[PDB]
Ligand binder design. Sequence first.
Ligand code: HEM
Ligand code: HEM
Ligand code: HEM
Ligand code: HEM
Ligand SMILES: [K+]
Ligand SMILES: [K+]
Lengths: 142, 142, 146, 146
Amino acid sequence: SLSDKDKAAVRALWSKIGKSADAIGNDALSRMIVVYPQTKTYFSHWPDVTPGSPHIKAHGKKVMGGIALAVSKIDDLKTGLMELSEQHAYKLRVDPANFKILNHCILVVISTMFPKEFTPEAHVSLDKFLSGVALALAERYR
Amino acid sequence: SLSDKDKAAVRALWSKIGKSADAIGNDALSRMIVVYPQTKTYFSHWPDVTPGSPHIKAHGKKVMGGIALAVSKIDDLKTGLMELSEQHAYKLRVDPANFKILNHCILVVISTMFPKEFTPEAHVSLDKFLSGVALALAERYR
Amino acid sequence: VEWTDKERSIISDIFSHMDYDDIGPKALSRCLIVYPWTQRHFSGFGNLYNAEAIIGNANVAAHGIKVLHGLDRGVKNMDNIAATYADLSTLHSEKLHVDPDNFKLLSDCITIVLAAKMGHAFTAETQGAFQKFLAVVVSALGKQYH
Amino acid sequence: VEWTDKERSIISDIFSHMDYDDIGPKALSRCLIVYPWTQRHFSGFGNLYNAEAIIGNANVAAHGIKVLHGLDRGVKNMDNIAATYADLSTLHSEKLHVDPDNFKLLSDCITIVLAAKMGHAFTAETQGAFQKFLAVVVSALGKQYH
Ligand code: HEM
Ligand code: HEM
Ligand code: HEM
Ligand code: HEM
Ligand SMILES: [K+]
Ligand SMILES: [K+]
């Protein structure tokens, strides 16, 4: 569970880096599909699946807007992300294993772009938060 | 999270198998250290670490005693297992990955001992339950 | 991997007695119910809306037996498993688009269904050898994902 | 493990520019903060109840430099990494009692600290190769746990 300390740390960090959400998604999703190519199975319906492609780019925006939502719903991620959970559970059927992979990629992208803001304390709290985002997206799966 | 249907399935199953908790615990820790020998690192202070030993037998009692606690506390595992969580966090420093290993071994144990009772529907709910127990035990970690 | 003679023995033993028409359906049904996102691939299998539809679904049944018999080539090739499965791997990646983490999940279900069948005979050492074999098979199935 | 010439060059170039004195303490520091059960093995280094307390601990800083130097032998022995790390593996398991999952966790922390130091030079392909290397060393470190 997230403490007040965690919540504060995530909101301060997002306050600082949110402006870069779209760039962060493109980067993180590009990293995911390059470094963990098995994740490409979920994008078999796109024309192609390549780093920084139009489709990866636009999705990267949408995924990080989902993270934006989660920061705003941080006091109740289960309720806050229920529609996204329904989509991921019933339409996409993304194995929750993959959320851990993207989460790692997000942390690496933020380290590369925000070295000074992404402190070990920022990192423990964001890692806790993303694990909670992953669990909330998994809420409607079984 | 656990639904009322999940909670009822875990309670009905534990009602059926709980009188063999001690045996369950022996068997599961025995499987854990044989099949996943890296877990033996946490028991380096014991005289030895071998299946069915008196130490494994007593530890199994204690562990499944914890599962019985979690069943009684199923409506709020976070609160219910906080004291146990602080023990694993500060005193024992057990990496949360190992809870996943021992949960699998418990499911294998129960399947062997109660194949009629351990239906797929029982399994999905108990798995959700054990993942919740694992998460609750990590509550005081970081 | 480097097998011990006892491990070879245990695996050969399990597979000699494997009731595939029984274990196969049970394991895939259980997987579909415990890990319902694995149903992604079986929309043409008909009704899966609940546990009962799945357990009663003859298409899942036949596919379970098939997957289980897919392990046979590894038993017959214990020192060549990664190459023996290269084409199956490529199949699951390029044409079926199956998420390879799903393999792990199915594996665990198989292990738990076999544990139900063998009971007391599914000793810790038997489980060790069996999961080791399944882990080596699963690695090989996920190998050709590019 | 089959390495590509591009993977060899990437890994080679990373360890020739890396400042062990900067990265080692930060990566070990970050791990004991993000994954505090790794503190299991650093009893008498003084008080580690605090991130400031951890990041200023001299004993942690010196161990993070040691671990990072432990990577050198794998760079030197890229096609024989399991064997190179066997006695180190045996030490971690039988003498130190280090849970090997901790190896993966420190690995990720090293990756993240390197990423903050390299910036946009830590490309997707660079991360791939670097994580590939750490993964093979980590598997090695875990091999002799019996
Ligand atoms: C941090 C975790 C992630 C969040 C917050 C997230 C966010 C979202 C959201 C907001 C959308 C809906 C887009 C729209 O408006 O149409 C989306 C769609 C989807 N996401 Fe996720 N996602 C997560 C992780 C994943 C993972 C890791 C993958 C694949 C491995 C995945 C695969 C998909 C796919 C395939 C769709 C549909 C996109 C399309 O049809 O083009 N998501 N997700
Ligand atoms: C299903 C999850 C688990 C339950 C509910 C649980 C429960 C327990 C209980 C009730 C105690 C006794 C605390 C006391 O001293 O009063 C205990 C201690 C301990 N547990 Fe856990 N535990 C679980 C998983 C494990 C795992 C996965 C490991 C490591 C692989 C671990 C390692 C230990 C150790 C080393 C001790 C002390 C035993 C001794 O010193 O002899 N726990 N646990
Ligand atoms: C131990 C793990 C598994 C093994 C050894 C295995 C093996 C098999 C084999 C032998 C076939 C037949 C190839 C063909 O007819 O072209 C196949 C088909 C297939 N497998 Fe797997 N499989 C594994 C797990 C998975 C999982 C977990 C899923 C998805 C949840 C799955 C989805 C399917 C599908 C969709 C096909 C094609 C079905 C059809 O169109 O008839 N497989 N697999
Ligand atoms: C990337 C993985 C790591 C590598 C390459 C590495 C390698 C090594 C090496 C080269 C030594 C010196 C052994 C000797 O004196 O002969 C050492 C010792 C040790 N390492 Fe590891 N290490 C790794 C991860 C860790 C982790 C994750 C832990 C703790 C959480 C750990 C705990 C220790 C301890 C307690 C010692 C004993 C130091 C001494 O007293 O000399 N190591 N490490
Ligand atoms: K709030
Ligand atoms: K109640």
